Write a protein that binds this ligand. Sequence first.
Ligand SMILES: NCCC[C@H](N)CC(=O)NCCC[C@H](N)CC(=O)NCCC[C@H](N)CC(=O)N[C@@H]1[C@H](O)[C@@H](OC(N)=O)[C@@H](CO)O[C@H]1NC1=N[C@@H]2C(=O)NC[C@@H](O)[C@H]2N1
Lengths: 122, 130
Amino acid sequence: ATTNQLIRKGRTTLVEKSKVPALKACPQRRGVCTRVYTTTPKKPNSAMRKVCRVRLTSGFEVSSYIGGEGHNLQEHSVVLIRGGRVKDLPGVRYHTVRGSLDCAGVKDRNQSRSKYGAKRPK
Amino acid sequence: SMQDTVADMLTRVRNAQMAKKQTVSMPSSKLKVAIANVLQQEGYISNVEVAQEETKSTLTITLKYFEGKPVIEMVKRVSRPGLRQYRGKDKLPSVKQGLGIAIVSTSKGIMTDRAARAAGIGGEVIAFVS
RNA sequence: UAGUUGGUGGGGUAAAGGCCUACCAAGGCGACGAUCUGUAGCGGGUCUGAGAGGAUGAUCCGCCACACUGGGACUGAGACACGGCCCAGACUCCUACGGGAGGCAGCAGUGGGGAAUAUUGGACAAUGGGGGGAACCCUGAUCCAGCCAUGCCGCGUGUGUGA
RNA sequence: CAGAAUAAGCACCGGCUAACUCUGUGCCAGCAGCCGCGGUAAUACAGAGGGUGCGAGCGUUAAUCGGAUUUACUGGGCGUAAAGCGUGCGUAGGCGGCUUAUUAAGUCGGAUGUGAAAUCCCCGAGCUUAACUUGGGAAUUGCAUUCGAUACUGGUGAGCUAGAGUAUGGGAGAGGAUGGUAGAAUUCCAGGUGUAGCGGUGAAAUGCGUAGAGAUCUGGAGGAAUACCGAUGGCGAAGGCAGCCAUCUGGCCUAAUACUGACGCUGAGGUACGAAAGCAUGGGGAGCAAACAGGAUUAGAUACCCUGGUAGUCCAUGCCGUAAACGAUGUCUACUAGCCGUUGGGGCCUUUGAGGCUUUAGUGGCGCAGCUAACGCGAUAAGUAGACCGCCUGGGGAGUACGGUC
RNA sequence: CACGGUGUGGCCGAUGACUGGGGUGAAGUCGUAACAAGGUAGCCGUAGGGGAACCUGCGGCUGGAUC
Ligand SMILES: NCCC[C@H](N)CC(=O)NCCC[C@H](N)CC(=O)NCCC[C@H](N)CC(=O)N[C@@H]1[C@H](O)[C@@H](OC(N)=O)[C@@H](CO)O[C@H]1NC1=N[C@@H]2C(=O)NC[C@@H](O)[C@H]2N1
């Protein structure tokens, strides 16, 4: 570009879209579990992974992964969700916080307890 | 069309040095002669001559080669008609940490950036030579 | 764009001025973005970056604007006035049904919303502010205290020996 | 004063990245920032031991800048990776040849005023240290006024001819528009000679023919296109332009004087032209041939092959505005080894007529330097520089939807 | 003159029976269009036709092999 072209029309900056639109620039969001179910991974992965469709206070309905082994969730549960992708699951962009509102911490876990929300053993 | 005769002169000198010519010739002007005199004083070129046929005037420059390489290794036009560059006395550019020269047109005539700083004046930065 | 742009006579203001008015003229703005439209309090500053730049405008200081929503004026040196008045609107409260009352975006606090942010505390002793000749009175400004690992900085949870 | 008495957790150990083994499970349960782990010996899942990093904290999520030269002013690109508008003309604008006088707007220098305090930085001071508080500086890169300088840019006056243009002689060309005309060939019609085939394919068949084909000879009708010359030739802004002749008409090349005296380059908007197909009205229609019909082939044929055949291809008057509209390379200017072809001109030399040297404007093949990721480009640059414009910012969604113009 | 009312016309948002294309996932059905001369060279513009990749006509390009 020439100097005159730059003066007539400057440079253009393209805005970056957020990868967590449903949070709406908040660290976490509260939602009501609409449907808890299991899904299969995209190739080359095979499993039965636990996910829940949740309606958020932001007015959006999304899908959130349930981490750890063993969960007590069901329909009409109230959960807290944070950001975070699951990679091999198409369209799962959020995670459910363990042990926050109605979700419970994982059982018989003694390492990385702050994640999955397990208290200290006696 | 030709709209920068100073850039034309610098390009002629650059191409002559790259082709290993002994002399280079161009149509002459007072600004070009002033720049060539500064080059000769700083030692990048050997001799400057002006000849006159009638109304026409021709400028001839004798080039210097030391060892195998040409003496003028880099010559860059800085100010151009599309973008003029003016600097104050405190922001005169230095070429190669003072090992080269910046040709500056000031109100006291054309000089190097070193002479301009010594005189405490600024002006238009014409070219970098190293 | 038609009080629109300029002029004259008059009015009006603390004061210049289409600020208003009656006539006269056809002007005034716009690709250097007028008009319309979306968003937004502005600055000193703050974060990042080698720099140039980019993002931001809590806490401190200056300016502006607002006070349930709109339209007004009074008193006064000063207001078109958060805890003043008049009018219109929505809402809320008391009632013996005759008649009345109100505006926490002041401090504390309640409900609600939210991932999330505190006590319905003490004193005018200090610095200021109002009144008074003074004595002195008032001051949720302020100075302090309470709660929270929210941040920064500091300290401890012991030291030596012991194969 | 009493007595160790009251006071350690969190994340991680496949690579990026400091820290490794054993059990349990077997593409399950699960992990995951990216690349990826798990399908019987998992240092990557869960537990344990050990270790590493931090420590009243440790991790996760969210957000800003950076790394990102990934909007490139500093500081990027457009032959093939994304990217030169299909091509011209031209408005606003940007930029602009040489000499001289003057001005002082840009530009540079000095002085003065201002740039609140706090904040940032420096030297100190007080907090048991530190955070923190605080004295004084430095800084606030800016703005305004005034006084100076005149090299460059701008303004004004004067002058010049190397850019640009004008008149006069000569030259080449499928440049454009209109109207005539010539020869070859295909088809059809008529007639003579003549008699069983012709045509078509890999092979066949559909088809034509004993109311006489095909073949051969004579005459006539009509439409479309111009063999040989013909060429890496020519002309045109591009799209494009071929028989011959006349009329009207554009540009280019070439020589020498003469003339004007910067009158120039580029160009957002705008406007003109713009292959083929297609559209509208009216003509024309030989050959060819989308659609369509039939015959073959094939597992199927919807196609390739064969026999037919309508739009269209042609003309007049308009529209449409798109192509791998390509050199996938915007226009203009200057400069930078050489060698060999070719087209249109100028000059010189032989010495008789045909050759040999140069120079200019086009058109080609190699190739030094230089450039490029490489391929390659290389005086017809993709090299060295300048002026202006257009365009690009991962792949799809998508040159799509909506709105608007035509 | 604020608030209000009437008529008509703009712009924005939400919602709507039904309807059209797009992406992703999994490879189930019919074919084999492209990549070699991909077995009819490919592609571009345009027009017509077809269950579908696609086929055919006209013009263009080499980013086409063998000669
Ligand atoms: N002011 C300046 C004025 C400029 C003037 N107006 C025009 C001008 O000067 N332009 C500069 C030259 C650029 C040139 N166009 C680019 C080029 O040449 N190839 C493009 C790059 C492709 C690739 N990288 C090389 C390649 O594949 N090569 C082949 C190859 O050698 C050979 O083929 C085979 N299979 O072996 C040959 C014979 O078929 O063909 C060549 N291919 C071609 N030869 C043709 C040709 O030259 N042109 C037209 C077109 O057809 C060209 N393709």
